[PDB]
Coordinates of C-alpha atoms and ligand atoms in Angstrom, one line a residue:
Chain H
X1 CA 110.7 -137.8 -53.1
X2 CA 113.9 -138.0 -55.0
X3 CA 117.1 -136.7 -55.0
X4 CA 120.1 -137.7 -57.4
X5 CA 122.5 -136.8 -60.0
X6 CA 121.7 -136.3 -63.7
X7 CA 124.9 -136.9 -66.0
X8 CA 125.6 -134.4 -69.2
X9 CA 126.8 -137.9 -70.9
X10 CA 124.1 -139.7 -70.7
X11 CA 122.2 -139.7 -73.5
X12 CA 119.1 -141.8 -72.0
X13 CA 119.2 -139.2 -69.0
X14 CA 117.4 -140.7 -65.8
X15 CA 114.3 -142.0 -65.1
X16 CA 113.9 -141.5 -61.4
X17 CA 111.3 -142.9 -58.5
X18 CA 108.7 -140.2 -59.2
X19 CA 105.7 -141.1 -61.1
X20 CA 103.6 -138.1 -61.9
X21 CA 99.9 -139.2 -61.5
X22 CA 96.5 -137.0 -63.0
X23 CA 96.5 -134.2 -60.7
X24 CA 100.0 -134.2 -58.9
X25 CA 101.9 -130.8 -58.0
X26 CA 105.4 -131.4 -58.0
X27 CA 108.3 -129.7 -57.2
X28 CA 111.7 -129.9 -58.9
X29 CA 115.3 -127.8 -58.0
X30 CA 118.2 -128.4 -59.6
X31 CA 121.7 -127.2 -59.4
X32 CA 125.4 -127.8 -60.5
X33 CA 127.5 -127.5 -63.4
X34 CA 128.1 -128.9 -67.1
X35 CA 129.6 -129.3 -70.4
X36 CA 127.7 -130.0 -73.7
X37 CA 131.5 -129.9 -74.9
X38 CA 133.4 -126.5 -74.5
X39 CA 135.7 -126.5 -71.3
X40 CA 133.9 -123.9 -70.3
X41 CA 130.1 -125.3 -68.1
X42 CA 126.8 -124.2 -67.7
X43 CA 124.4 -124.4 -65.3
X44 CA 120.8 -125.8 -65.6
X45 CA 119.5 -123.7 -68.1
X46 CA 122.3 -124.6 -70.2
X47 CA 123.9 -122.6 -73.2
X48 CA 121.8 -119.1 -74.5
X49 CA 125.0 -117.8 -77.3
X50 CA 124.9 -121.6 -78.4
X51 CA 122.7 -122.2 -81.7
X52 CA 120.0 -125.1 -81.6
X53 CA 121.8 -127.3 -83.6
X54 CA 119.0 -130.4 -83.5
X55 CA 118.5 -130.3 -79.6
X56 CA 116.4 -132.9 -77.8
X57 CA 114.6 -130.3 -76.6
X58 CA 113.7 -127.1 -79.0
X59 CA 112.2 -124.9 -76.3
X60 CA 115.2 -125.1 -74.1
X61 CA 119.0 -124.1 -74.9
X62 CA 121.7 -126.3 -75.2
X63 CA 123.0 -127.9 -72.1
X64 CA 119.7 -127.2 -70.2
X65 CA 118.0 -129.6 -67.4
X66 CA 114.9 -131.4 -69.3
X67 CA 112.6 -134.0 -68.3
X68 CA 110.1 -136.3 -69.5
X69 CA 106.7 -138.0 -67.7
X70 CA 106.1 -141.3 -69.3
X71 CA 106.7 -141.0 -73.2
X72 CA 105.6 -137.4 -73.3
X73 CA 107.9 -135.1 -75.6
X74 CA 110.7 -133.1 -73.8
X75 CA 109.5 -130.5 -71.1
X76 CA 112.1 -128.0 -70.0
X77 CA 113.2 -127.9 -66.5
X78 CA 116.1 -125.6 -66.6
X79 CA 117.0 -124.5 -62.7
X80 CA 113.4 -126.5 -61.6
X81 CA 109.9 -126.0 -61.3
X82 CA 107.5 -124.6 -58.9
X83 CA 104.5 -126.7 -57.7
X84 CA 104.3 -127.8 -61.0
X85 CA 101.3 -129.3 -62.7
X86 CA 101.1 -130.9 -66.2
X87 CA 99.6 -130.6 -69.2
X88 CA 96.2 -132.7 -69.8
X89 CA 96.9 -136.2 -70.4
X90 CA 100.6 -136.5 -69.4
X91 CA 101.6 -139.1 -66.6
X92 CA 104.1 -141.8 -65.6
X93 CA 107.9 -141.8 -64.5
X94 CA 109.6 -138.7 -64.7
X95 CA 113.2 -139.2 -66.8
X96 CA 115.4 -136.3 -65.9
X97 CA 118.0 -135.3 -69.4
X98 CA 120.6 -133.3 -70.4
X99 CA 119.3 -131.3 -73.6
X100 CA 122.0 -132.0 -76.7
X101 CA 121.9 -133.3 -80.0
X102 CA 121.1 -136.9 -80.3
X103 CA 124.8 -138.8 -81.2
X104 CA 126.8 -135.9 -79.4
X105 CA 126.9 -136.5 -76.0
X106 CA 129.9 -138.4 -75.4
X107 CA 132.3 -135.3 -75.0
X108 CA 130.3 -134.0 -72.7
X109 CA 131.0 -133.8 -68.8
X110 CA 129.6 -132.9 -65.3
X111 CA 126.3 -133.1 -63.9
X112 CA 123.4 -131.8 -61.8
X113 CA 122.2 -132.7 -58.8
X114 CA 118.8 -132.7 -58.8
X115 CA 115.6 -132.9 -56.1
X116 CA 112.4 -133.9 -56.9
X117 CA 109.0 -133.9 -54.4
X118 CA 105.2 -134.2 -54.4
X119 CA 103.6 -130.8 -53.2
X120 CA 100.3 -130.4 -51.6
X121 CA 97.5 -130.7 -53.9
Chain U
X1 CA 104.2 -117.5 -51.5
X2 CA 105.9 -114.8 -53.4
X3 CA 106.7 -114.4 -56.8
X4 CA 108.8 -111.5 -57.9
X5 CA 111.9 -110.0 -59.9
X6 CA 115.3 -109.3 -58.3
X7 CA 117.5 -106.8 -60.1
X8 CA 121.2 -107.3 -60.8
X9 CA 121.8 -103.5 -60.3
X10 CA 120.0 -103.2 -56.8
X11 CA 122.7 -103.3 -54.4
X12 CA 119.8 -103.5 -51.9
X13 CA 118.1 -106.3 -52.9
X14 CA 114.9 -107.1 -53.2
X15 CA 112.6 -107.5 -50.0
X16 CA 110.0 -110.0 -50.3
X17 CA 106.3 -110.3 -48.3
X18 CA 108.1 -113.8 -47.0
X19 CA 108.4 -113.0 -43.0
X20 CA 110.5 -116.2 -42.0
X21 CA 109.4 -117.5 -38.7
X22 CA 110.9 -120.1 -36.2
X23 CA 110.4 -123.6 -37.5
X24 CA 109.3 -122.6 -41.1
X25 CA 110.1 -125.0 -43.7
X26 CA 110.7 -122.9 -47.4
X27 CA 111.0 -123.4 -51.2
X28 CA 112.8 -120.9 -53.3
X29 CA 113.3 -121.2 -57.2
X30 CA 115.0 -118.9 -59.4
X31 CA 115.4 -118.6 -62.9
X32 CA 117.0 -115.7 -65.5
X33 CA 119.7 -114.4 -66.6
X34 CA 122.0 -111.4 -65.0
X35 CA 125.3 -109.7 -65.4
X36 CA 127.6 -108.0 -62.9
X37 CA 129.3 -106.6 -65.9
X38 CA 130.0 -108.1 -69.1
X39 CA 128.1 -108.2 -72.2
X40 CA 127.7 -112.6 -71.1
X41 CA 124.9 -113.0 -68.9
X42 CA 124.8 -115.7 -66.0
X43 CA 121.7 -117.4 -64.2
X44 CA 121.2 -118.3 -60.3
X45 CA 124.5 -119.4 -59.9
X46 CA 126.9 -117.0 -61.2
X47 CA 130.1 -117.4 -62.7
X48 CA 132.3 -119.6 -61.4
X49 CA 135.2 -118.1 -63.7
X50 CA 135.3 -115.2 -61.3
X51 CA 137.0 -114.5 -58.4
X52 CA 136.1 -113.0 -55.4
X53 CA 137.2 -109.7 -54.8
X54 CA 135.2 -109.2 -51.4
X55 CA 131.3 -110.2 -52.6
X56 CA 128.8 -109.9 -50.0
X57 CA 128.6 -113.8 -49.9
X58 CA 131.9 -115.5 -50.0
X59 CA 129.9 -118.8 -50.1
X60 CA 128.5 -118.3 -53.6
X61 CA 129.8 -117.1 -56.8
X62 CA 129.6 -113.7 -58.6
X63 CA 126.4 -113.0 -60.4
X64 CA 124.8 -115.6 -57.9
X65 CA 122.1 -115.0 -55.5
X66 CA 121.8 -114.9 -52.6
X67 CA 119.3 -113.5 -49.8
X68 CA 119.2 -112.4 -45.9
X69 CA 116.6 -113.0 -43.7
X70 CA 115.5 -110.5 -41.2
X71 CA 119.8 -109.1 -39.9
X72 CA 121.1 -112.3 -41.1
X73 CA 124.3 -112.3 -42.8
X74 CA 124.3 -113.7 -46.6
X75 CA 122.9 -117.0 -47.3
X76 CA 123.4 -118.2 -50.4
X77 CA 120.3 -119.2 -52.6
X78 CA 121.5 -119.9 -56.2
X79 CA 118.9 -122.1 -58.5
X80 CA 116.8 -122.4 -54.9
X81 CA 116.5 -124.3 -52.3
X82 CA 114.2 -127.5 -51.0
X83 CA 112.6 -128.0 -47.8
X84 CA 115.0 -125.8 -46.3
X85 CA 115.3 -124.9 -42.4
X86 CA 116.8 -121.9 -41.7
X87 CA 119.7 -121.7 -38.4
X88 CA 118.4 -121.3 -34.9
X89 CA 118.1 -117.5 -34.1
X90 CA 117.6 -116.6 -37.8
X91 CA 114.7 -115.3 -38.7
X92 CA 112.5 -112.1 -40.1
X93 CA 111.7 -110.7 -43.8
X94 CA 113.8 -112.3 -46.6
X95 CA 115.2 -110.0 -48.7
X96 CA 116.6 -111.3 -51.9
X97 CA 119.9 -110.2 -53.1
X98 CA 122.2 -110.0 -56.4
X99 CA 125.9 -111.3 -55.4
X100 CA 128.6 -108.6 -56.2
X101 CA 131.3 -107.0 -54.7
X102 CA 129.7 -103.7 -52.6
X103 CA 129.7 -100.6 -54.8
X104 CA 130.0 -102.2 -57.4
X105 CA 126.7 -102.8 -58.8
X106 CA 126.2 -99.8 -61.0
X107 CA 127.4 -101.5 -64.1
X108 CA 124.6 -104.5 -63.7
X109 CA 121.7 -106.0 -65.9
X110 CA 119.1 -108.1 -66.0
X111 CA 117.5 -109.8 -62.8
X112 CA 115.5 -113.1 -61.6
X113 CA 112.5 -114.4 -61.5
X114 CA 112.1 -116.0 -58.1
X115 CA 109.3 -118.2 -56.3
X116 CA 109.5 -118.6 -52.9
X117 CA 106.8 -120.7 -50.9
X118 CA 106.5 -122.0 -47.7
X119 CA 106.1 -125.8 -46.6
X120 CA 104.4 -128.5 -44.8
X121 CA 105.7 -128.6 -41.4
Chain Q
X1 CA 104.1 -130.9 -36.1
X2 CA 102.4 -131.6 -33.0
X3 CA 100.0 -134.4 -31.1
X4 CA 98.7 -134.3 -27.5
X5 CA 95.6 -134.8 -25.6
X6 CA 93.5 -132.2 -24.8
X7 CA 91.7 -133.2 -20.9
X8 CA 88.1 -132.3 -20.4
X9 CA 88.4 -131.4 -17.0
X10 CA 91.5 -129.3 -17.5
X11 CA 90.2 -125.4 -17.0
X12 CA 93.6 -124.4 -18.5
X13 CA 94.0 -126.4 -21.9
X14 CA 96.9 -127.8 -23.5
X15 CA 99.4 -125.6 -24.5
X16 CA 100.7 -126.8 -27.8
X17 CA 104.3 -126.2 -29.8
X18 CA 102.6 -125.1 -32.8
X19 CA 102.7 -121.0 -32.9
X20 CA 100.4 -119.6 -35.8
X21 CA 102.1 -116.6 -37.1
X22 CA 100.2 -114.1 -40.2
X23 CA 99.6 -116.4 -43.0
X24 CA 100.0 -119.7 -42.1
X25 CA 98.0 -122.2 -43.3
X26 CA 97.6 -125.2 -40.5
X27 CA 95.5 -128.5 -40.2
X28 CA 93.9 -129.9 -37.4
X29 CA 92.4 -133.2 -36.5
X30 CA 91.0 -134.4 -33.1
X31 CA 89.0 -137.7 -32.1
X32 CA 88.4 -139.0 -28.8
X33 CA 85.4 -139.1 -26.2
X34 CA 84.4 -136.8 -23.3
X35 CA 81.6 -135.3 -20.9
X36 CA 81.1 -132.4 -19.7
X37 CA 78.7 -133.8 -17.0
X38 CA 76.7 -136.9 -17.9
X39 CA 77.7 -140.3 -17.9
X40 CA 77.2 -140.1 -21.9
X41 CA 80.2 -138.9 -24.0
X42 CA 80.7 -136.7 -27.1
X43 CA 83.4 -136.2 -29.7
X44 CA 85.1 -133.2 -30.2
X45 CA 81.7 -131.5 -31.6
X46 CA 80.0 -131.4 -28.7
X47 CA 76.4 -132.2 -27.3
X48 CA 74.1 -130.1 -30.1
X49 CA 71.3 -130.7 -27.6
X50 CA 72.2 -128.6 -24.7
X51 CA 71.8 -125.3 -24.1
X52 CA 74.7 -122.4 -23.9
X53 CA 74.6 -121.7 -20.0
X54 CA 77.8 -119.4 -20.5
X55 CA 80.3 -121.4 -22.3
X56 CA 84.1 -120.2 -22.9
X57 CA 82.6 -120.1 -26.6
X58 CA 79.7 -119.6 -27.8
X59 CA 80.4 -120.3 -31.4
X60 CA 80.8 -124.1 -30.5
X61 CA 78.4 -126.6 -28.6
X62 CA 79.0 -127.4 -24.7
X63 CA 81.9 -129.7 -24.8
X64 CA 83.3 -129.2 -28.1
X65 CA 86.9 -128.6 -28.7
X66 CA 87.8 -125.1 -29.3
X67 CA 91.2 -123.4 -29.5
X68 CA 93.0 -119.6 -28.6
X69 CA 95.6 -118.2 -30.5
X70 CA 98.3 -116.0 -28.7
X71 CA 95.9 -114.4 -26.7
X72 CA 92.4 -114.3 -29.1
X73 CA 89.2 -114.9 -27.8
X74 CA 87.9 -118.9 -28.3
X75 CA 87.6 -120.1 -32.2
X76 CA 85.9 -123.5 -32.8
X77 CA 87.9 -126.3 -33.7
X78 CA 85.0 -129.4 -33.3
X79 CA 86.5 -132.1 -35.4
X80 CA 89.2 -130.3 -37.1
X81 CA 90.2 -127.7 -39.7
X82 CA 91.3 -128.4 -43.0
X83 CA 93.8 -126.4 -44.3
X84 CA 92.9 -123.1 -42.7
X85 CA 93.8 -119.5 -42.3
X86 CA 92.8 -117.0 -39.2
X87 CA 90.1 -114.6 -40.3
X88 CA 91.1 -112.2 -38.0
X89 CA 94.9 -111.2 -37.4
X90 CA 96.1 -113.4 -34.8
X91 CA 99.4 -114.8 -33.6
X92 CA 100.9 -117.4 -31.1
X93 CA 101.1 -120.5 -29.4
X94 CA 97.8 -122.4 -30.2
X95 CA 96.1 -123.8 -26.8
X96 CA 93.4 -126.5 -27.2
X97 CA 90.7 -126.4 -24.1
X98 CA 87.3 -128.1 -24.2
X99 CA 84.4 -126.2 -24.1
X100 CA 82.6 -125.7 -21.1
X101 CA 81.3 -123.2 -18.5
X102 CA 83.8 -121.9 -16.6
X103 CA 83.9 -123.4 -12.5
X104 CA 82.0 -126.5 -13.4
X105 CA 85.0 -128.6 -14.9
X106 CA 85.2 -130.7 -11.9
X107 CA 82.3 -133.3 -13.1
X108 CA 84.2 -133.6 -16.9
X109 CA 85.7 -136.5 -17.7
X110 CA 87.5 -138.0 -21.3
X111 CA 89.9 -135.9 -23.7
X112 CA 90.4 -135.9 -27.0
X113 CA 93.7 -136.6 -29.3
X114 CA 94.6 -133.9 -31.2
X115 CA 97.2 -133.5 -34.6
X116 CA 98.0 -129.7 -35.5
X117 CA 100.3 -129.5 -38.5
X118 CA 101.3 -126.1 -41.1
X119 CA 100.4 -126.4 -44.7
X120 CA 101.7 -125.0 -48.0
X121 CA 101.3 -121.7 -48.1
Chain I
X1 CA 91.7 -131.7 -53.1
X2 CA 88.3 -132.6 -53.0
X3 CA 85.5 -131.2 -51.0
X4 CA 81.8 -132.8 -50.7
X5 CA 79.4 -135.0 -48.7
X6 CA 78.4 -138.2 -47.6
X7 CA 74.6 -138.5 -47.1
X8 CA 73.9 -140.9 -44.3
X9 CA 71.5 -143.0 -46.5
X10 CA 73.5 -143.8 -49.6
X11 CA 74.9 -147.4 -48.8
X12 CA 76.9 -147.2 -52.2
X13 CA 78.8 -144.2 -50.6
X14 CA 80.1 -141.6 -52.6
X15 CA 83.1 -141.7 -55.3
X16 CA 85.4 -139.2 -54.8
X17 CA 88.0 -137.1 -57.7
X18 CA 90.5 -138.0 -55.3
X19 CA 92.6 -141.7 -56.6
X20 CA 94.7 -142.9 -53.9
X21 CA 98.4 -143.9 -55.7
X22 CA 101.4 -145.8 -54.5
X23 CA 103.1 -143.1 -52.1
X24 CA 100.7 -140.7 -51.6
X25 CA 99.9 -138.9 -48.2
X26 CA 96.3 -137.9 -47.5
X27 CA 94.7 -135.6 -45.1
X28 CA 90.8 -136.2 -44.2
X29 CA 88.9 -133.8 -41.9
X30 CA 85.3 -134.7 -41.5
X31 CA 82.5 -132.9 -39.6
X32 CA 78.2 -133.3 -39.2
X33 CA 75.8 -135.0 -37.8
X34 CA 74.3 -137.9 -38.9
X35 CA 71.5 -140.4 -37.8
X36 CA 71.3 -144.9 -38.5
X37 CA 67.9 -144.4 -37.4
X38 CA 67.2 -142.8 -34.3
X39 CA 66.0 -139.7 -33.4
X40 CA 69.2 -138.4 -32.1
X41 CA 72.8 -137.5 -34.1
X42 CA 75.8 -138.0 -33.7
X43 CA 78.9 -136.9 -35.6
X44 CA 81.5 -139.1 -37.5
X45 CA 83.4 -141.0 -35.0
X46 CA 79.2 -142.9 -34.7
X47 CA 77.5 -143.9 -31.7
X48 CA 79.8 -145.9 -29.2
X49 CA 77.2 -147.0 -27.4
X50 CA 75.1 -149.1 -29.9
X51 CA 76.5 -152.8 -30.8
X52 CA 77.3 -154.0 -34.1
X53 CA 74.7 -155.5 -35.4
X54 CA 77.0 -156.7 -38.7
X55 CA 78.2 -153.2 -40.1
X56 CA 80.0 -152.8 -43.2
X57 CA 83.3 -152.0 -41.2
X58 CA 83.4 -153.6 -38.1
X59 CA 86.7 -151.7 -36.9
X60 CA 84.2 -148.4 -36.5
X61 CA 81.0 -147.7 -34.7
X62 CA 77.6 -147.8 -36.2
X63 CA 76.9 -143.7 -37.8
X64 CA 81.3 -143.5 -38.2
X65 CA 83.0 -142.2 -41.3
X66 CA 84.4 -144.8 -43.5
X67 CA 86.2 -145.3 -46.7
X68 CA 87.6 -147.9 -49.3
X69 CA 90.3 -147.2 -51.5
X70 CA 89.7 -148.9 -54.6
X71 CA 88.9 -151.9 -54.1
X72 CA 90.5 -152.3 -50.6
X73 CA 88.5 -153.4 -47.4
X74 CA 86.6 -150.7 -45.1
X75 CA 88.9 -148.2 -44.0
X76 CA 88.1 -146.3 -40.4
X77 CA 88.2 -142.3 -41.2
X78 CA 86.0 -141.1 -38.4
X79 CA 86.9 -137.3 -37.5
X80 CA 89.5 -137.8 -40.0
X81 CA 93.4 -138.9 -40.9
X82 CA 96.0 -137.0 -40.7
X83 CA 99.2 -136.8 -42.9
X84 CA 97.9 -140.8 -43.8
X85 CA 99.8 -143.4 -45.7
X86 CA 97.3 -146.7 -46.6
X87 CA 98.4 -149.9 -45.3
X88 CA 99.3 -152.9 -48.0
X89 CA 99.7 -151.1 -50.8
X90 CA 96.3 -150.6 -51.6
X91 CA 95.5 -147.8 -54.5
X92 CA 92.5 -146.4 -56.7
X93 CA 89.7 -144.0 -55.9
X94 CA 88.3 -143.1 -52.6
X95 CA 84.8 -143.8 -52.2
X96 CA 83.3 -142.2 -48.8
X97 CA 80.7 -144.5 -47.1
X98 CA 78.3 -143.6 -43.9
X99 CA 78.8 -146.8 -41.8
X100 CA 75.6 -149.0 -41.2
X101 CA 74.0 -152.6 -41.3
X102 CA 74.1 -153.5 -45.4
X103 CA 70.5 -153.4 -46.2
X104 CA 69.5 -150.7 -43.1
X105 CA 70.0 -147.9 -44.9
X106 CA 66.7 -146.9 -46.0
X107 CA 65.9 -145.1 -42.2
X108 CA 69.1 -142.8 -42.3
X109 CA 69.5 -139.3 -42.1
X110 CA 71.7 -136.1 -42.1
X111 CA 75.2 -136.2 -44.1
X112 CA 78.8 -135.3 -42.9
X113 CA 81.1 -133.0 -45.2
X114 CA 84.5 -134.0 -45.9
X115 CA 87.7 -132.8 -47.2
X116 CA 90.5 -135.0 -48.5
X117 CA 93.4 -133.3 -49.8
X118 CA 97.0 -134.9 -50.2
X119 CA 99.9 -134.0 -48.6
X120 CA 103.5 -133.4 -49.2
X121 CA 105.7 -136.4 -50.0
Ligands
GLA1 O1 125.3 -128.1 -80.7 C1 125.7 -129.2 -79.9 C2 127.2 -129.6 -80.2 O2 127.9 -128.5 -79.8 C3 129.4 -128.7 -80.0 O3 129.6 -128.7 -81.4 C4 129.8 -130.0 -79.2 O4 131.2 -130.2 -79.3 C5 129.0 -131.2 -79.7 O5 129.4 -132.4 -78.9 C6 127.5 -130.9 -79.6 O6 127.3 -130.9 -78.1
GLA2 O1 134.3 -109.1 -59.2 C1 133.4 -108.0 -59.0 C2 133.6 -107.0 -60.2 O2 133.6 -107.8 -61.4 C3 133.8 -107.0 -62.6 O3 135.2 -106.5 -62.6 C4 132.8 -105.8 -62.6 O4 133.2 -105.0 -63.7 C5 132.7 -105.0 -61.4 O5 131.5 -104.1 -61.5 C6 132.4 -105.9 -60.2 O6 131.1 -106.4 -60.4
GLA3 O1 75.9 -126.2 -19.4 C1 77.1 -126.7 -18.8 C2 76.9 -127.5 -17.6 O2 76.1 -128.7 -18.0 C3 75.7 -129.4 -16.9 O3 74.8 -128.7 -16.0 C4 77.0 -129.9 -16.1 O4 76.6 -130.8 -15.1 C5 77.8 -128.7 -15.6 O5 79.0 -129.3 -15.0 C6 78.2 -127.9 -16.8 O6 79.2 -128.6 -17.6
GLA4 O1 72.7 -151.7 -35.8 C1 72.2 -150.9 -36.9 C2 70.7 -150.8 -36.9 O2 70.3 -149.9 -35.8 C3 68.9 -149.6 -35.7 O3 68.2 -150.8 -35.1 C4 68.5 -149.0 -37.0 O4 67.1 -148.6 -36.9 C5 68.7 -149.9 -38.2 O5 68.3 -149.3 -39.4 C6 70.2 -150.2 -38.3 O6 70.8 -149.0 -38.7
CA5 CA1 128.2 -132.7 -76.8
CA6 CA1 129.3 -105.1 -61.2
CA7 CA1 80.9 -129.7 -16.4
CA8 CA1 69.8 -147.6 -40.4

């Protein structure tokens, strides 16, 4: 299992200890708050007033918890996922991200904490 | 496991099939978007703008939620919880629960959508 | 969790910590040697080549392992289960006891190791 | 999880869906009865009473339940494993192999089934 942080400033996000193999259930919960930019702070499904603006990830809002396995594309996490299984094809370590647009995250502040396990399967 | 809906106008809350037993090991996560009020809407966690002005949890925010299990007093659940172990003596159905001040709840919108599963132990 | 031995000559059983409540999911797996009699010894399925002369369950061959929940009747456990429910509504503490007719324990000999964990459910 | 058999003649054993990776727990429960030649069965753990006559895993009796991982050694798996991590990081598929002479196959009978599922971690 994992557990950590996951920084709203770091662009790269976090590639943690998980590696998601063919057939794994996972489950991931996250919690905590941050800042995209506004001194206001969201939680991990981020932003929904806030317009998609060129976001890392289209299919979740601004300032939501993302992730990717391997060098998939971005797969929203938001508040976590529930024994979880992947698409067809997609494997390797999981990088947790904050979802902003690329060059934009240095004003940005806060984190979540984040846990990661393998479930049954 | 149990998958289900909590509404944010429910001062009841929302009882679940989940009996929690002595020594059980549980997963809970939540997603959506709620309101205690305003026109904004909040997931899991609440506002944390707010203050309290006599919630039935103290522990988490307004908006958050929460959940009692059997004649427990308030626990707080917010985006979920992992591998958790409930206090000696606690135990019974787990009812799920929108936090807001008592009474209150008439002017409420929008719910969760909240899995709750039970572990390897 | 729990691991014990379960003693062939022991008309009683092995009480265990493990207490099966409605739904639970649970795992067994038990190894070891015994006899019910004969110098030979079985594992925990038993002698398929002798007759039932009145064993505590008849479901299982003479000097199997077998299990009661709460109060049930005998349900065969042999080698283990894998992940398994009660077909019938049962609760309690699960004791292990080897299968044999009752009054003529005094000749048994050998136990068998047992692991009882919950699952996912 | 997978569920199938091992045929007590098939000295190739039997691949399995299940790929053993770096961190993974396993649960096995196997059951049957199973014959190296004589007339008689006997059920996974083998016959304790015949010597090994240069079996293809010399840590089990002749008629046990065994197992490589990739391309590991001869694993015991008898009755089964429970909540199992494999020793020196061995990884790949699990292939499920009746134990007997190499070459004595061809007189074998019977099968065992076998579930393998994996386990939280
Ligand atoms: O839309 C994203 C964008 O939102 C605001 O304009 C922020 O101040 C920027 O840093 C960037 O996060
Ligand atoms: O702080 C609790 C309180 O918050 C606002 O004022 C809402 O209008 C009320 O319905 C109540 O929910
Ligand atoms: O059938 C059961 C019976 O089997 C033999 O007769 C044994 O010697 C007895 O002690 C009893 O275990
Ligand atoms: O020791 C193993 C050996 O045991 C007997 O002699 C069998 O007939 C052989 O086929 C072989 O399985
Ligand atoms: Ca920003
Ligand atoms: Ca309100
Ligand atoms: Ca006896
Ligand atoms: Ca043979």
């Amino acid at each position: 299992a994992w557990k950590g942080e996951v920084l709203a400033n770091n662009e790269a996000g976090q590639v943690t200890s998980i590696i998601y193999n063919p057939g794994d259930v996972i489950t991931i919960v996250a919690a905590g708050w941050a800042s995209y930019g506004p001194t206001q702070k969201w939680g991990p499904q981020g932003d929904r007033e806030h317009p998609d603006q060129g976001l890392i990830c289209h299919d979740a809002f601004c300032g939501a918890l993302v992730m990717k396995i391997g060098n998939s594309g971005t797969i929203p996490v938001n508040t976590g996922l529930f024994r979880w299984v992947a698409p067809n094809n997609v494997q390797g370590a999981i990088t947790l991200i904050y979802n902003d647009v690329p060059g934009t995250y240095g004003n940005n502040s806060g984190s979540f904490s984040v846990n990661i396990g393998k479930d049954q399967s």
